[PDB]
Amino acid sequence: LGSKLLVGYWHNFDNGTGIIKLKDVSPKWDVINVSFGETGGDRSTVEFSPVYGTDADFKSDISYLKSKGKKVVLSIGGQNGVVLLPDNAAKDRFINSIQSLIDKYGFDGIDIDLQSGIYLNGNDTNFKNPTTPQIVNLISAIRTISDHYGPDFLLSMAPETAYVQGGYSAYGSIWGAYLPIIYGVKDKLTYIHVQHYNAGSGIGMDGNNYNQGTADYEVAMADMLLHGFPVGGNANNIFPALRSDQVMIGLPAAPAAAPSGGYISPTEMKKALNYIIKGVPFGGKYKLSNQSGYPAFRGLMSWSINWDAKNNFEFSNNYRTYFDGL
Numbered sequence: 001l002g003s004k005l006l007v008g009y010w011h012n013f014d015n016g017t018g019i020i021k022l023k024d025v026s027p028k029w030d031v032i033n034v035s036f037g038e039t040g041g042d043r044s045t046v047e048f049s050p051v052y053g054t055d056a057d058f059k060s061d062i063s064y065l066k067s068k069g070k071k072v073v074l075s076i077g078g079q080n081g082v083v084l085l086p087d088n089a090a091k092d093r094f095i096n097s098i099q100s101l102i103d104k105y106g107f108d109g110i111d112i113d114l115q116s117g118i119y120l121n122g123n124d125t126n127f128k129n130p131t132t133p134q135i136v137n138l139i140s141a142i143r144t145i146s147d148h149y150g151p152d153f154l155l156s157m158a159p160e161t162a163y164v165q166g167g168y169s170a171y172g173s174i175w176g177a178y179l180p181i182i183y184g185v186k187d188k189l190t191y192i193h194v195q196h197y198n199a200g201s202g203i204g205m206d207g208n209n210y211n212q213g214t215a216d217y218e219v220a221m222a223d224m225l226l227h228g229f230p231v232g233g234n235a236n237n238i239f240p241a242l243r244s245d246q247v248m249i250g251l252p253a254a255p256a257a258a259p260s261g262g263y264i265s266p267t268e269m270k271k272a273l274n275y276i277i278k279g280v281p282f283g284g285k286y287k288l289s290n291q292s293g294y295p296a297f298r299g300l301m302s303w304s305i306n307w308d309a310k311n312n313f314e315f316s317n318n319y320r321t322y323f324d325g326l
């Protein structure tokens with residue numbers, strides 16, 4: 001896996017942007033997050049069927065990409081996905097159904113993109129030791145699935161900001177709810193790409209409010225994970241820094257990819273990237289915690305490959321050239 005990645009979500013569906021067959025995906029993407037595994041009635045058995053091709057065709061397309069150095073990852077969740085693991089039985093259905101799918105298609109890893117059904121219960125106050133079954137069991141399942149595969153099974157996650165940086169303001173309900181998951185699987189975690197979009201405003205470690213889609217916002221939000229931060233207003237409850245190589249930023253490929261805002265122009269985003277990676281500022285209001293940068297910052301994720309293809313390949317072309325240019 002390269003040191004500066006472009007991770008692109010791939011639509012296993014036509015939402016009007018069309019279907020791109022796997023071999024027609026731009027090689028600028030290093031990792032392809034196939035979207036999405038979802039559940040039926042039991043909310044625990046994950047299901048997936050390719051939007052084009054026989055199962056064997058799709059598996060073959062995945063093998064081809066892998067032969068080219070690309071990673072093809074199964075994403076679980078997104079917008080409409082629901083996974084509920086109230087008990088061990090549900091956890092086991094989740095584990096087994098996901099392993100079967102990885103075995104069936106040869107996926108390189110999994111991406112956790114669960115955006116519903118995840119809450120810190122009352123009394124669940126310690127991110128190092130969660131008590132909410134959904135959280136405890138998700139952690140357990142993720143470790144178990146990761147441990148079912150070889151030395152470079154890829155694990156990623158794409159939580160919304162409330163679940164992560166939100167933990168700076170509160171710890172309970174959705175606020176900070178992915179912190180225990182991140183912490184619980186950090187030794188297996190390849191990288192996390194929080195969704196810096198459909199997000200409104202975020203509070204930086206300088207206590208200031210930042211608006212999504214601005215360079216300052218992107219730096220302030222990433223710095224939380226790069227530096228670590230106190231949780232829920234408690235100076236004595238510090239969430240530790242992840243490895244810089246575990247930190248990515250998730251962005252919309254085009255304005256329309258995130259209908260509630262979040263899109264940032266590459267020209268503005270490169271300002272943020274230069275500051276995060278090299279400690280080179282751009283006259284912004286946010287001050288980076290390490291003013292000489294975090295060189296090992298892992299790269300950018302985008303929703304999505306399909307949106308990118310529809311937007312003059314702006315995201316993939318701009319950021320591949322930027323990262324290659326470093």
Ligand SMILES: CC(=O)N[C@@H]1[C@@H](O)[C@H](O[C@@H]2O[C@H](CO)[C@@H](O)[C@H](O)[C@H]2NC(C)=O)[C@@H](CO)O[C@H]1O
Nearest residue numbers: 015078079080113158195198256257258259303
């Ligand atoms: C990772 C990620 O961006 N997850 C969310 C996306 O799922 C979501 O895109 C929407 O996904 C739906 C399936 O879950 C599609 O039906 C829907 O068409 C698609 N919407 C668009 C505009 O592409 C994005 C939307 O910005 O939000 C993410 O949170």
